[PDB]
Ligand SMILES: *[C@@H]1O[C@H](CO)[C@@H](O)[C@H](O)[C@H]1NC(C)=O
């Protein structure tokens with residue numbers, strides 16, 4: 001690669017107001033404490049709702 | 055302080071129906087499930103179902119599918135459990151519960167009963 005910059009395309013907040021972004025798994029544990037990928041988000045329902053997103 | 059206050063005792067004859075009430079206070083009534091669990095005399099706990107006040111989505115146990123109807127209101131922060139076609143073995147104590155134990159992992163993503 002000649003040039004390469006990591007940028008936050010969909011910020012954890014502001015981008016998913018009506019979904020839950022906190023999802024983590026024990027299969028991706030950092031320091032024996034469940035975590036998840038640093039470049040992806042697990043979207044889940046907020047308050048019994050997973051509204052259609054675009 | 056979170057609190058669930060249920061309706062008063064009921065005496066019915068077989069075939070009749072009941073509608074038990076569960077009014078919530080101390081939290082936003084729409085954030086968490088309302089579970090329904092019964093306990094017959096001397097025996098253990100038997101889970102009946104849940105209803106999520108915000109969406110209205112329902113999860114009925116298998117034994118109770120069709121015989122039971124769970125509803126809400128949201129305006130008065132109340133959930134309802136209607137039982138139909140009652141029978142002597144339906145004599146029991148009916149508890150409601152709040153699904154406020156938010157899950158820690160998406161492996162076991164279950165709202166436990168606070
Ligand atoms: C989230 O829900 C609110 C409710 O009024 C709505 O105004 C907003 O546009 C929604 N945002 C997204 C990204 O769906």
Ligand SMILES: *[C@@H]1O[C@H](CO)[C@@H](O)[C@H](O)[C@H]1NC(C)=O
Pocket residue numbers: 050051052
């Ligand atoms: C998503 O689209 C489906 C199909 O029309 C609709 O039934 C549902 O209500 C929509 N949900 C939201 C949150 O808009």
